[PDB]
Specification:
part of a larger assembly; 2 chains; A: about 50 residues; about 25% helix; about 0% strand; B: about 210 residues; 2 strands; Chromatin structure-remodeling complex protein RSC6 (chain B)
Chain lengths: ~50, ~210
């Protein structure tokens, strides 16, 4: 229910940094191991 | 072009020492500037000019009876010949500036073209006829670097007196960041690169390589 100017502004902002609608195919980029080595990862979330 | 050498030729002779504790440094600066002015007078007199033979064994040449009419002499060095021929081409205003050959030049050159470049003219003219200073400059530049070393150690300890908290944390970070650089090439030494001990990031690298 936001005004159109802000909706298009935030949408172009998110698309600028490639957070949404990022044109990419994973068949042309090979995999790799990051500086962070293998470990044991968890994501803590607030109780719903 | 000057030839590059393998040893330092000069040194900056630093000037961050306190000029009220160490004395006679300005005496050194005055002596160096004076030696810098005592050789600008020598190099000048090495390019010295001399006028010793306008007119005045192979230095003496007998001129032909034809060229003896453009010179006034019958013998003399080749320098006098080419100089006096040029002077004759110059006095009579023969160069085209609006060389145009004169009447007697027709005979002396045996040419009837009446117009010839000066290059051909002088062609027809020919057709008709030290260690010790290096040691001193290395000994001095071997002391201005010892001075440039003691001055750096003074600069360090003096900048350690003021702000010791700032210098010590820099020393501890330089240490923790340089002992790592020196320990980066101890993995490839040909006696620990064929014993299969370092092959069990040398595993993600083969992933990047195979993809490449």
């Amino acid at each position: 229910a936001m005004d159109v100017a802000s909706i298009v502004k935030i949408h172009a902002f998110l698309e600028k940094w490639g957070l949404i609608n990022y044109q990419i195919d994973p068949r042309t980029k090979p995999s790799l191991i990051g500086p962070s080595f293998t470990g044991h990862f968890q994501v803590v979330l607030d109780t719903p | 072009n000057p030839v590059p050498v393998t040893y330092p030729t000069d040194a900056y002779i630093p000037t961050y020492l306190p000029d009220d504790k160490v004395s006679n440094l300005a005496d050194l600066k005055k002596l160096i500037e004076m030696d810098s002015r005592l050789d600008l007078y020598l190099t000048r007199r090495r390019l010295d000019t001399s006028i010793n033979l306008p007119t005045n064994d192979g230095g003496k040449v007998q001129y032909s009876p034809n060229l003896a009419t453009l010179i006034g002499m019958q013998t003399g060095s080749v320098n006098d010949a080419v100089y006096s021929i040029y002077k004759y081409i110059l006095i009579n205003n023969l160069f085209v500036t609006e060389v145009k050959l004169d009447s007697l030049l027709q005979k002396v050159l045996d040419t009837n073209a009446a117009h010839l470049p000066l290059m051909n003219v002088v062609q027809t003219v020919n057709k008709l006829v030290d260690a010790e200073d290096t040691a001193k400059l290395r000994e001095i530049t071997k002391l201005a670097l010892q001075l440039n070393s003691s001055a750096q150690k003074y600069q360090f300890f003096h900048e350690l007196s003021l702000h010791p908290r700032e210098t010590l944390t820099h020393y501890l970070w330089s240490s923790k960041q340089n002992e790592l650089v020196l320990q980066g090439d101890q993995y490839f030494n040909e006696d620990a690169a064929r014993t299969s001990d370092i092959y069990s990031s040398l595993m993600g690298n083969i992933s990047l390589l195979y993809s490449q």
